[PDB]
Amino acid sequence: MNIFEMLRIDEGLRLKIYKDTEGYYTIGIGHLLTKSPSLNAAKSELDKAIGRNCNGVITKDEAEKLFNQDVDAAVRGILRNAKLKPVYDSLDAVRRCALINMVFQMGETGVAGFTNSLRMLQQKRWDEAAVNLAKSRWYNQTPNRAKRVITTFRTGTWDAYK
Ligand SMILES: [Cl-]
Ligand SMILES: [Cl-]
Ligand SMILES: [K+]
């Protein structure tokens, strides 16, 4: 298990534009296109992202290219965020992947708002952090995925993805 395999499980792979869990146009392995309700706007974002007129459909290799870019951007995003960087640096490699997963799903700003959970993670108060993480819109709206991520933070193992 690694961050790519983890997010591939959580996000799936679809080669046509689809709506994500929040109703937003997305493609590939959870590549958000736009929050606009306009399908034409989403198709424009897609073509810009890929560099050709895709008419709402991409190939697996293109999906995986966007995924590489998105994972890189989530990680470097963590390192550029003054709230997230110290927590990330304090963590082991498996728990780092849990934090990357949250940022991929909700964005840096959103994750940086988990102030109390982040502090418990930095303190290595794993059971307490896990309880706190679940007190969230995130958990209530996507509970099965959040439970997997939270188990990863609680244990520092891949048990929820094996
Ligand atoms: Cl709750
Ligand atoms: Cl879920
Ligand atoms: K998805």
Report the chain's terminal Cα–Cα distance, integer Å. 8
Tokens encoding 95: 């728990």
Between CA 88 and CA 65 the distance in angstroms is 25
Question: Strand, coil or helix: what is 96?
Answer: helix
Residues 77/70, Cβ–Cβ less than 8 Å: no
- Tell which residue, 103, 129, 106, has the closest CA to residue 118: 129
For 152, phi and psi rounded to 5 degrees? Answer: -65, -45
Between CA 87 and CA 97 the distance in angstroms is 12
Catalytic residue check, 20: yes
Ligand 2 centroid – CA 143 distance (Å): 5
Tokens encoding 79: 């390192």
Question: What technique determined this structure?
Answer: X-ray
Residues 127/154, Cβ–Cβ less than 8 Å: yes
* Binding-site residue set for substrate: 32, 104, 117, 132
For the chain, give the residues followed by a break (C–N over 2.5 Å).
Answer: none
Tokens encoding 14: 């679809």
Beta strands in 57-120 (DSSP E): none
Ligand 3 centroid – CA 153 distance (Å): 21
What is the b/e burial string over 111-137, where b = at least 16 CB atoms within 10 angstroms of the residue's CB? bbebeebbebbeeeebebbbebbeebe
CB within 8 A of 22, min separation 6: which ones? 141
Residue with tokens 């937003």: 24
In angstroms, this model's resolution equals 1.1
**Hey, what amino acid is at 61?**
D
How far is C-alpha 131 from the geometric centre of its chain's CA atoms? 20
State the fold for domain 1-162.
Lysozyme (1.10.530)
Tokens encoding 93: 């490699």
Ligand 2 centroid – CA 136 distance (Å): 13
Q: What angle do CA 8, 80, 86 make, to 5 degrees?
A: 90
User: Rounded to the nearest 10 degrees, what angle do helices 143-155 and 3-11 cross at?
Assistant: 160
